[PDB]
Each structure stands twice: as structure tokens, then as C-alpha cells.
């Protein structure tokens, strides 16, 4: 396999389905990347993650650099080896969590959620290399929502400068430039002219993929979709389009209809432990009393191991009892659900009936 | 298979190895029963529990009657069906936890750890039937340690009266008497004459198995072994001898050398989440800093999936990060370790080299 090869096999409107070939494996797109917070996808063995159909997982640079540390993981053989996942892994830059959990043009210094740490385009790229990430995200400065035109521009402009620095830092590292891929991130908040300038900047620098950043920041689905409407088209068509931190089932469908190829969200994972189970008829809260004696599986159609062997009543009991097994089963289900969603999306686009699938999915999901 | 059939295939001193045939499966003895607190063996899927080599698990009547309730589990098809375990299940009477987590000759009434509940020989047996337990424990009155000769006698005497009531209650329930087995419990604290009277009483009533109760109550290994020395021999030889709540590896070996066939302990499970990992060279605390970069498996010889795929450094990181996966891997390992211990015990007795195995095990375990 090549370092990186994105080939589109089918299209329908702005939607695309295809594959990304990488040294560690093939990624079917549109793809959903489960989130591996601290070198683990919450409550799941990597083989179980793989069993759900995931072709790639995402790793949080921020948490990892804090515990167990980038250098240690490197000394231990890398992230893949450390956690037992031998397929592709995409790592974010850590920038978001730094702000979420002293900023300057050089970068950012911060205190661990009490140790002191620094992060910059160069250091972010380095850490991701130490982790052995297959897909590296450029380090940027996120713009809070809402943001003023002046502030959004200043952040996008800095982000673009940082993108060039990420690009150069990535290329200066032989092993990384030859075995990994680099994704740039589009900024500009909700302003079209800024998004356009950002897209132009990233394209001039040149990346293996382009992410749309700054969304899923509490603006609501409509505002997001509206921004995607004009933003994604600005991005190079022959490269993957990655929507960051967007994972609500209905958000994914809409983003794909707008040209997005990759998603990542902690929702299926986090929601799992909180008792939220995804189904084709909408999400349910398994902790609700109505499921105490419900013998049906979490979802009538799901093909995951959980729905084949356990009832809602059992999982209901496990979650309300705080039992670990509850979190295990819920999460396997949710991630499994998500993968089946992506599969249906890929099949529908490939068969030219995705628009219909989108309509059918929403009608039933929101019924 | 028959309702119950205990056959001894080999002996060495007081040690015995054989099998217990039951409707739901064969139990190889000496056996270790993992503990399923609230319809779950902490952090493990039943298939994983089975994968470790366990032939039977134990269910806590007390917790179950509280959440999700005996009647509900029955309505849902029984414990086996509820949790996904189709092999034999032994359920305690709940009496111990009632005292541990208004007593009278009729029984005991208590407040949930705030609901009010009652438990008696009849109700205990009934609940266990509702759960669908394969091996039912007679309901008794535990005697605290230390206990006076007068108090120990009074409790043993009541326990013996309650044993007869458990026996009769069990027999009055057709389905239960025909598909399940009943174990009586020997009491008498550390007094030989009381233990003898207790053994005589239980034998006159007649049970499918005899448990030695009241031990593992903080008396220390020596006192326990000393009590076993004269207690186990009082029990009928052609029936299983079950030591309750004893599971430290070294305790098990010694109890088997004294004629015990069955063990149950929450140690491998509880210790798992606390970071204690069992190895043939003694237990270790994976949370200790010395394992931060240790790439070896939890145990050099273990054949469990955990030791085949993950390092101490990884599990070290998971436990210190409070990650669920840490508890999952630790517990699978510990239970796997325990099953391999029982296998080695069964093989050694079967080959007439158990005494040597006991010596070799202790020498290395305490090295
Ligand atoms: Zn499912
Ligand atoms: Zn192991």
C-alpha cells in the first residue's frame, strides 16, 4: 500500500464514497473514527472496536501528552503497539483541548488539568510523530463561537500561518513525511470570505486532506450546515474532507450530503456510559424505567454482538447499578451502530440512492 | 446429564479431583467460582468468563434481591438468561451480606443499604429458585469472629435448625428439587465439638454438598487451616466440600490439601480494579511506578488473552487513568490466573504429584 491514496469510487451530488489507502490499512469513506481518549476507546478492546467495522480510530494528543506522555509512548513502541490497535490512527493537534480543558504567535503554554506545558505547530507535529500517528492534524488556533469578523480573521490568519509551519515541520521529518499524511484545517468561523481565504491558503500550501474546523461549537445544526454549504466546496475536491467533532447521526448524514468524508465524535462513547443508546428510531436513555423489563435488544435491526446476546432490561440494570459491563455493552453497541450507519451511507452513495437514504433515515430517526 | 453427580477420579491425601455433573454442565473439581455480584462478573462478558476456563459462577442473592429483584429476574427468564451465562450457577443464601451490608428464630428483617426486606430459610430458598440457581445454599446464621462457646453453639444450633428448614423448603419445590442441588453449611466457629455436632446434623438431614462456613472471618490462615484440619473430615466424603469466601491463591492450595473441592472469592475481581494482579511469583500492584515502562505481560507464563496482547505499562497507564479497559484486562487476567491454578491443582492430584505442586507453588509464590 502507498503512504496515502484517496480514490473516489462514486458520487451523488456533493456526496462521495471511496477509500483512503495507507500503510496500515484501507479506510472506507465516508468514515467515522471512534475516539481513543487516553490510548483507549472507552470500555472497548481494540479487537472489539475493529469488530464493529471501524477502519481507523482517533487519538487525543492533549490527553496523551499529559498521561502517559508522548516520549514514553514512543519509547514503548508507539501508540499502535501501546494500545493494541494496528490499523490507521488519526491524531488531533491537542490545541482544542488545551483551550477547552498564555497564547502567542509562537504558540501556547498551559497548566495540566498542575504541570506546565507548551504546545506549538512544531511541538504538536513532533508529539504526533512520537505517537506514530498515521494522519497528522495541523496545529491551529480555534475561534470561539460566536466570534467577531475581526477576531475570526485574526485567528484564521494565524491558523493559516501555523498551517504553513505545521506543513514545514511535518516535511522536515523524513520518517513522518514518508509514512504519514498531513491534514490542514480550514478556519474563518461563519464568514464566507474568511473561509474562502482559508481554503485558498491551505490549498496553496497543499495537504493530503482538509478539515473544516471551528464548527460544532454550539451554533446549531442549521448554522453549521449553512457554513458547510459554501465552505466544503472551497476545498480541493480530490482530497478527503474532514468535519471535526461532529458525530450526531443526523449531523453526519447532512455533512456527507455536503461533501464531508470523515467524522469523529466522543458522543457514541460518552453517551454510552451516560446511558444514551442510538437506534434507527432515534436515541433512547436505557436508564429510563420503561426499559426495566424490556427483553428486546437495544435496536431491532442492529447486528452488533450486544443486540444479539443481551436485552435492554439487562443493560438497563447494569447502567443503573453502575456496573462496568453496562458501559462496555452500551459503547460497543453505539459504535457498532455508527459503523453500520457509515456502511449504509457508503452503499447508498455507491448505488446512487443516498439522497433517498438520507430522507428515509431522517424520517424514521425523528419519527 | 443428571441433576447432580459427584464422582471422584483421583485422590492424594485428603485432596480430591473429580467432576460434578449437572443439567447445565460439568464442573471440574477442585473448582473456583468467579463471583457475579449483581448479575455480572465485574467488567467481564460471560463468554470471556467462560474463556478463562470457569465451569461455574456464583451469584449473590442479597444484591440481586435488592437490584434488580428476584421476581423480576424470574419474569425475565432467570439469571442464566438475564446475564447470558448458560452454565451452572451457585447462589449463596444472602444471609452473610444482610449482616455485612432484626434477627429472630424465624429469620431476619433488614433495611436496604432504604427499603425494608425480610429473609428466612424459606424465603432464601425461594429467591434462589426464582433466580434459577443450580446449586442452592441453605440459609444460616453466621457467627462473628471471635465468638464465645455459648454464642457459637447457639448460632450453630439455630443454623442446624435452619438447615432442616432449608432442606424441607427445597424439597417442597418440585422443579427445584428435580433440577437443582442443595448444599448445607457447617458452623461451630473454631470449636471442634460444635463443628462435629454441626457435621452430624447436616449429614442426618442429607445434602448434595457440604460447605464449611464461618471461616475467612479475620482469624488468619493458620487458625483457618487448623479448623479445616478437623472439620472437613467430619463431612461426608462422597460429596463436594465447599469453602466459602476463601480465595487467596495460597489459601486455596492449603484448603485443597485439606479436602476442599470448591472455592469462591471476590478477590480476583475486586483486586483487579484496585490494581492487584496475581502472578506465579506473588501478587503485584500494577499501579506501582516500577511498571510504567514494563513491556512484559502481567505474568510470564499466563496464557490468558491479556498477557498475550498487552503490557504491564499499558495496563499500568489504564488503571492510573481510571480507564474502564484497565479494570477489564486486570479482571480477565486475575480470573484466568485463578482458573489455571485450579487446572494445575486438578492435574497434579490426578497425577499424584499434588503435594509437590503445593510445595513448588508456595516456594515461588512467596519467594
Ligand atoms: Zn447493537
Ligand atoms: Zn494473564
Residue numbers in the entry:
A (entry chain A), B (entry chain A): 11 to 111, 116 to 127, 130 to 383
Please give sentences taken from the publication describing this entry.
Transfer RNA–guanine transglycosylase (Tgt, EC 2.4.2.29) catalyses the exchange of a specific guanine base in tRNA molecules by a substituted 7-deazaguanine. Bacterial Tgt functions as a homodimer in which the protomer consists of a (βα)8 barrel harbouring a Zn2+ binding subdomain close to the C-terminus. The reaction follows a ping-pong mechanism including a covalent Tgt⋅tRNA intermediate. Hence, in an attempt to generate a model system for the active site of human Tgt and to gain insights into the relevance of particular amino acids for substrate base selectivity, we adapted the Z. mobilis Tgt active site by site-directed mutagenesis in order to mimic that of the human enzyme.
In order to investigate the importance of Gly232 and Val161 in human Tgt for queuine recognition, we created a doubly mutated variant of the Z. mobilis enzyme in which the corresponding Val233 and Cys158 were exchanged by glycine and valine, respectively. To allow the interpretation of the obtained data at a structural level, we determined the crystal structures of the mutated Tgt variants created in this study in their apo-forms as well as in complex with preQ1 and queuine. The replacement of Val233 by glycine results in a considerable gain of space in the substrate binding pocket most probably required for the accommodation of the dihydroxy-cyclopentenyl moiety of queuine. In contrast, under the same conditions a faint band representing the covalent enzyme·tRNA complex was observed for Tgt(Val233Gly) and Tgt(Cys158Val/Val233Gly) indicating that the reinsertion rate of the excised guanine was significantly decreased with these Tgt variants (lanes 5 and 11).
